[PDB]
Amino acid sequence: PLTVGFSQVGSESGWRAAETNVAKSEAEKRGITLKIADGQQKQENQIKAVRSFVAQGVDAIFIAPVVATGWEPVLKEAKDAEIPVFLLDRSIDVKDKSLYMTTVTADNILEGKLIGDWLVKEVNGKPCNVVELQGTVGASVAIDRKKGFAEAIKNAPNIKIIRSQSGDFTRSKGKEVMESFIKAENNGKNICMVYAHNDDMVIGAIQAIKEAGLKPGKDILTGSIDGVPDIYKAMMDGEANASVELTPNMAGPAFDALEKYKKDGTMPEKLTLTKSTLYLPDTAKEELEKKKNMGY
Ligand SMILES: OC[C@@H](O)[C@@H]1O[C@@H](O)C(O)[C@H]1O
* Closest atom of ligand 1 relative to the 226 alpha carbon: 12
Q: Are residues 25 and 41 in the same domain?
A: yes
Q: Are residues 110 and 208 in the same domain?
A: yes
Q: Is 293 annotated for ligand binding?
A: no
Q: Are residues 264 and 281 in the same domain?
A: no
Distances from the Cα of 155 to the Cα of 116, 147, 159, angstroms:
11, 14, 9
Q: Are residues 124 and 264 in the same domain?
A: no
Q: Are residues 133 and 226 in the same domain?
A: yes
The residues after which the chain has a C–N gap greater than 2.5 Å are 291
Q: Are 278 and 118 in contact (CB under 8 A)?
A: yes
* Closest atom of ligand 1 relative to the 108 alpha carbon: 1
CATH number assigned to the domain comprising residue 75: 3.40.50.2300
Q: Are residues 195 and 228 in the same domain?
A: yes
- The total domain count for the chain is 2
Q: Are residues 113 and 19 in the same domain?
A: no
Q: Is 140 annotated for ligand binding?
A: no
Resolution in A: 1.2
Q: Are residues 83 and 193 in the same domain?
A: no
Ligand 1 lined by 226 (C-beta under 6 Å): yes
* One-character DSSP codes across 261-285: HHHH-PPPPSEEEEP-EEE-GGGHH
Ligand 1 lined by 173 (C-beta under 6 Å): no
CA distance 161 to 115: 14
Q: Cα-flanking dihedrals φ and ψ of residue 137, to 5°?
A: -60, 125
Q: Are residues 183 and 279 in the same domain?
A: yes
Q: Are 100 and 75 in contact (CB under 8 A)?
A: yes
CA distance 61 to 53: 7
CA distance 152 to 147: 9
Classify residue 33 as left (phi > 0), alpha (psi -120 to 50) or beta: beta
CA of 195 to the centre of ligand 1 (A): 15
Residues 6+ apart with CB under 8 A from 264: none
Q: Are residues 15 and 127 in the same domain?
A: no
Distances from the Cα of 213 to the Cα of 37, 171, 257, angstroms:
42, 19, 50
Domain that holds residue 96: 1-105+248-273
Q: How was this structure determined?
A: X-ray
Q: Are residues 158 and 289 in the same domain?
A: yes
Q: Are residues 156 and 31 in the same domain?
A: no
The amino acid at residue 25 is S
CA of 219 to the centre of ligand 1 (A): 27
CA distance 111 to 282: 19
Q: DSSP 3-state assignment of 203? A: helix
Q: Report the candidate in 124, 52, 58, 122 with the shortest Cα–Cα distance to residue 86.
A: 58
Nearest-CA residue for ligand 1 atom 1 is 89
